[PDB]
From TrEMBL, chain C:
First and last residues shown, out of full length: 37 to 140 of 141
Name the UniProt record assigns to this protein: Ribosomal protein L36a
Disulfide bridge partners, by residue number: 14-76, 71-76
GO cellular component, one term: ribonucleoprotein complex
Keyword annotations: Metal-binding, Ribonucleoprotein, Ribosomal protein, Zinc
Length: 159, 204, 104
RNA sequence: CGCGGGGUGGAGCAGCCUGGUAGCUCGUCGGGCUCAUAACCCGAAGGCGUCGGUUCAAAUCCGGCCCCCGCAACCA
RNA sequence: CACAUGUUCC
RNA sequence: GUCUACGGCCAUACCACCCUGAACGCGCCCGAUCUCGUCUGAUCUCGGAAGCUAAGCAGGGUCGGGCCUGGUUAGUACUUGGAUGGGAGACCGCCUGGGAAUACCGGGUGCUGUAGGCUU
RNA sequence: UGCCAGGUGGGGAGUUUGACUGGGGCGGUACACCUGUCAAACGGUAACGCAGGUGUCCUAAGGCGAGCUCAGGGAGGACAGAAACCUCCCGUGGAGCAGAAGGGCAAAAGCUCGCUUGAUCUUGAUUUUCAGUACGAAUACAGACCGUGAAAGCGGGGCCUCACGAUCCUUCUGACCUUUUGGGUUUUAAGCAGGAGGUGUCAGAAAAGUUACCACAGGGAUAACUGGCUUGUGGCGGCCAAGCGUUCAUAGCGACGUCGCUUUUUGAUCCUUCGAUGUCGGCUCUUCCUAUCAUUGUGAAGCAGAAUUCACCAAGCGUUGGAU
RNA sequence: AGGGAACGGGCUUGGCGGAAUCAGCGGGGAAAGAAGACCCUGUUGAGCUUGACUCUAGUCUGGCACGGUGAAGAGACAUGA
RNA sequence: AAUCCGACUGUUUAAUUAAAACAAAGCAUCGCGAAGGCCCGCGGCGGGUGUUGACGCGAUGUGAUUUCUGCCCAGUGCUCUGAAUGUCAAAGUGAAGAAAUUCAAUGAAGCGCGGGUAAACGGCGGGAGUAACUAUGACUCUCUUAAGGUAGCCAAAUGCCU
RNA sequence: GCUGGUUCCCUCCGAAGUUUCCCUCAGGAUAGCUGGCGCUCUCCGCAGUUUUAUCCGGUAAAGCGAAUGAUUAGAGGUCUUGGGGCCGAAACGAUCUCAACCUAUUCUCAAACUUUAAAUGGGUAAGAAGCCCGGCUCGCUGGUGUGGAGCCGGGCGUGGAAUGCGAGUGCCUAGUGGGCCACUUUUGGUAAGCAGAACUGGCGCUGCGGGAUGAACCGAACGCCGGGUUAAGGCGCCCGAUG
């Protein structure tokens, strides 16, 4: 049986990438985080106080509390029977804006622009996203030359 | 006094090299990995006869020594004492284990017996280079070394010039046009990316 | 471990950081008239051998050292105990170790 | 846990109850004695477990600490 | 009160 | 075009050598009474402006190293799923989809925010 | 003599004599924890799996502020050389940060100074094992008193991952605290809150052996036979050929290597049986196998004869009397 | 013979099998006789031992009461030069 | 004709063990002079030894005859004396307090301390130097805990190697 | 807490040998699985699925001419030193070297190495609980009716990827807590019908056709029947079918 330590198997998890050691960049510290922001977790090995547990590494949560120099968020952790909406306190260097939501917000703004537009026209423009359709049958040409014949190679022992 | 090679033929466990943790290992039987006229240039031994494995197995150090002596013994007799240069391209680093009896398996972890060499399919075991008139002297001598190895091995004569990574049909013109410089057993590849004073060192 | 005989720390009654006198608290006498001692003396009276267990499986080789903070400022005289981690050596107010000195 | 006592040259015993010299043997370097050996007699080292104080002055009387054993004791 | 012994040939 | 002050990204920015710097600047530089600290005004602090691009710094260059980004390596190695596939086994082949990393060969050698100058 | 108090008291009485375990016992702790790996790129994940470590230590090795760069290497300089001291240059850290290991750190988190005790008091919330319960550890805060710095800030112990313990009982501390049962006062005692005195079998009984005089309830969940898988070991047979064989590898052999068979040895496992399968040998007797000792028929010999070796079809027939 | 729960009378594939019996016989029916006693578990006991944990009979010692009488001495305390 | 054991006659596990086992005469100890030694008994001015008195009673070890019974009291037992006195309960004494209560001195037996005892339980090794081949040690020194197996005997009923 | 037994039918639903704790290991408690009792809504909402964007890895692979550890072989070096000598009193003067060191190469690796680095996976978001406005409150923060949060009032329906399914929720509650096998990954062991792990599926709990026989193999899961057609297997006879 393995030990029950807090930082078990974090040899490569809470380690800085190659040629990225030293002083932590200042743009991560002074980012702003409001309530309800979608935030993912990536533990940074330089700072140690406020370090999240390894089970939340790579997961994403939602901000419910903002303190002076730490942000409390609600993550979704599954433990063997259900997902727990649990509340953790974590320092800023482990906090990054999640851009998964940003694609949806820029779509809503673009959809509402095209919802106000053509409202005086009435045209049903395709508003929902669609999957990849069939490839819309087309003519393919070759400029005079015939498609050159390809040939399987004879076997030769390279080694 | 040891077990036969049937017990350790297959690559059963993870690689277990001799390191800080794996200590107390008896020394490998193979010490010299190449002999012959090794102090030779690349212009006089352009054959590059290779021994190629065909299975995913383990080759013991005493098996490598067994095929080292018998291949070298006939090769000296065939062309001469210094008419060849042979190498073995398996260095035994994996360490096999023994559960020695006198209890059962109550806390039974192995003790090192010796070294062994992991081999893949198509990886060169033994390399021999000599002149062009000793082509049949190398092939049949390597057939004698097949009997000292477990499993199936195949004999291939490569198209490489000596123990280098270059093709033998086009090895000459780079030497004449000065893109390759021999240095004993190997050759020096000269790219057009270094300082121009290095180009002025040659071509003069 | 070494702790000084004087330490300026918080006081409950005054509410401000004041200097305090540091000493080690030692276990007092059982006083023979506590509720548990009177219960145990009545239970052990008469026949029946012994009623309550005797702990004879000691494993700790140390004790948690305890201080006794005495408030030196007059008319307060507030006493307090501060707990420090386990150690087998403990002395008061001596040998500040003189960093950068002869090793022999 | 509270009533005690004792730690001493390279090794074993005093001097402690009363403070004034750290001593006696045994191992070592030698010197004498007997014609010589042996035995015996002598000179020399090298040391009061530790801290502080009372005191003209401490190993000595004191208090606290490290190493031991005598006892009596035991509800986390 | 102790004192034991002085390698062989001449 | 360029510099100073404070920065953001943190090597396309670093490292080694060579060359050029008009103006403003940045610095080199001259001193130690006062503020200050040392064994020593070398460092730090203060008071200055006779000289200078010598250095720092800026720019450019090296069939330069390094770094960044591509081709090759290679649909190779590997791998989700499948078979009453092979093989004595070791292992391998096929269908289905995904898809690497060396060596080697190319291109590039900092952008940019605010305030304040010079080229009036 | 009666009653108390102390000592002795297996003469007698009651009870105990932990757990895991490739049977049990012995050995160890895999029983409470910590690191890397196994661990199959979220997490979790086992074996008496591997290398290990812990029950400490620190008045500073804690908390600020300030200044420097370390290990190592090169060049030099009286004694001074391989290492004593001083200077210059290179130096992404290859040293150091208390310990085992991992991660992290360069005008620091390292080295050296100045000052200090945030190692102080009190609510709550969350994480870590989790049942999402505790203990321990930690993370943001909030209310105060502070330390340091010029300030921003930093700090309510140790750069992070372990360094530790419930009920009851006892001790101490705190309030102009409550009760002390008819009223009042005091001593005492019982409470409330916090800390300590420990349960290492570490979510915590108070606990020595033997039984061949033994008994009971069970177990093939588990050994001591055989049988079953495998063949480490034993035995047996092959392939290559450095050499032995007066020269000649293969008449007979055959090292260094390598491939296989057997359950007539010991092993490994516990799959069958503990509502019982009588557990060694010897005697007697029946049958079977060939890996053939001899006899039948043969081939080859370092087969001149004789005698003796190697090989083949071949189990039909034999393989003894005795000392211990 | 095979597989099976790893040794079949039953199952499968084959060999095949013919009423009712008598006297022997010990190959088998993992024959019967007994909930294995050898091994282990039980928080099941019993006998015995002791440096196991609690006690205790007995025994030794001290005090109180039964316990009265007289005479010296002696120890401490005290008075105290 | 020999070996081992038990001296022997005797007894023993009725129902697997008839013996080398038990007992036995002999030998050597221990306690006790009677309000005592050993023991029984819930109890008593109780009872057995005892209708008895050291040539006796009670508890032991060994096992005829002959010969001998060596060393060791460090350990565990047993026993002896002892203000030379560390510890030591109840009761009593002194002091403080309003009292419960607290403290102090005193402080029996027994443990310690000091002797004795091994026909008490028991134990009886090394190392180092050392004799005219070597070897070995007649001799000398040290501990652990007190000496280090003496007289005798054997590959034994006692020896793994065997 | 250990064995043995535990009595009528039918219908419906239907498991587990696992987490943690216990002097716990033949057993209990607690979670998990199951059954029953129901309730709140429908005639938005939820998915052992996929797609679109967004992050996480350090495993397979590969590398060491990149760090750390291990390691083969030759080359060019100069005085960076030294052992053997040789011409030297001696001299970095000369001189053939031989040694370690340095520089470019080269062979082979690492579960407790890594610059790189997959496939399979793990979180999200894909609207009404969302946007866009106007205004009040704040004892918190505040050059600035600044920032943040909370309250109000109002407008946007064009239900903002695919696919399918009526969903949510509250009580009691038995039994279980000895598992085993198999494709793949993988630990110890030479190996094992050996012991121990991950995912998934089976036996346990399950009949049927086939593999002659049969736990786990292939197909396929079952109310009682007729016709037709097949899977896997098969079609000389046993034995249906190539007579
Ligand atoms: Zn105070």
């Amino acid at each position: 049986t393995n030990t029950k330590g807090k930082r078990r198997g974090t040899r490569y998890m809470f380690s800085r990438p190659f040629r990225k050691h030293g002083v932590v960049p200042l743009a991560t510290y002074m980012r702003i985080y409001k309530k309800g922001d979608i935030v993912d977790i990536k533990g940074m090995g330089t700072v140690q106080k406020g370090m999240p547990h390894k089970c939340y590494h790579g997961k994403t949560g939602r901000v419910y509390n903002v303190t002076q120099h730490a942000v409390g968020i609600v993550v979704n952790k599954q433990v063997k029977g259900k997902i727990l909406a649990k509340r953790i306190n974590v320092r800023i260097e482990h906090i990054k804006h999640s851009k998964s939501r940003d694609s949806f917000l820029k779509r809503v703004k673009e959809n509402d622009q095209k919802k106000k537009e053509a409202k005086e026209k009435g045209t049903w423009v395709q508003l929902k996203r669609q999957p990849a359709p069939p490839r819309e049958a087309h003519f393919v040409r070759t400029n005079g030359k015939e498609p050159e014949l390809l040939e399987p190679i004879p076997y030769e022992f390279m080694a | 006094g040891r077990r036969p090679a049937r017990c350790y033929r297959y690559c059963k466990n993870k690689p277990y090299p001799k390191s800080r943790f794996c200590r107390g290992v008896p020394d490998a039987k193979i010490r010299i990995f190449d002999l012959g006229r090794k102090k030779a240039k690349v212009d006089e031994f352009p054959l590059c006869g290779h021994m190629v494995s065909d299975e995913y197995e383990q080759l013991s150090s005493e098996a490598l020594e067994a095929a080292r002596i018998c291949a070298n013994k006939y090769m000296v007799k065939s062309c001469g004492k210094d008419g060849f240069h042979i190498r073995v391209r398996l260095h035994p680093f994996h360490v096999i284990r023994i559960n020695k009896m006198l209890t059962g398996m109550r806390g039974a972890f192995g003790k090192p017996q010796g070294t062994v060499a992991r081999v893949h399919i198509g990886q060169v075991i033994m390399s021999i280079r000599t002149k062009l008139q000793n082509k049949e002297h190398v092939v049949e001598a390597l057939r004698r070394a097949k009997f000292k190895f477990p499993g199936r091995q195949k004999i291939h004569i490569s198209k490489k010039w000596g123990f280098t990574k270059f093709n033998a049909d086009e090895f000459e013109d780079m030497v004449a046009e000065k893109r390759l410089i021999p240095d004993g057993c190997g050759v020096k590849y000269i790219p057009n990316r270094g300082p121009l004073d290095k180009w002025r060192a040659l071509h003069s | 471990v070494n702790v000084p005989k004087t330490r300026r720390t918080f006081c409950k009654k005054c509410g401000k950081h004041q200097p305090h006198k540091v000493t080690q608290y030692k276990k007092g006498k059982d006083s023979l008239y506590a509720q548990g001692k009177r219960r145990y003396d009545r239970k052990q009276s008469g026949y029946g051998g012994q009623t309550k267990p005797i702990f004879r499986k000691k494993a700790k080789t140390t004790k948690k050292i305890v201080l006794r903070l005495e408030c030196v400022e007059p008319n307060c005289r507030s006493k307090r105990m501060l707990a420090i981690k386990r150690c087998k050596h403990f002395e008061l107010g001596g040998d500040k170790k003189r960093k950068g000195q002869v090793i022999q």
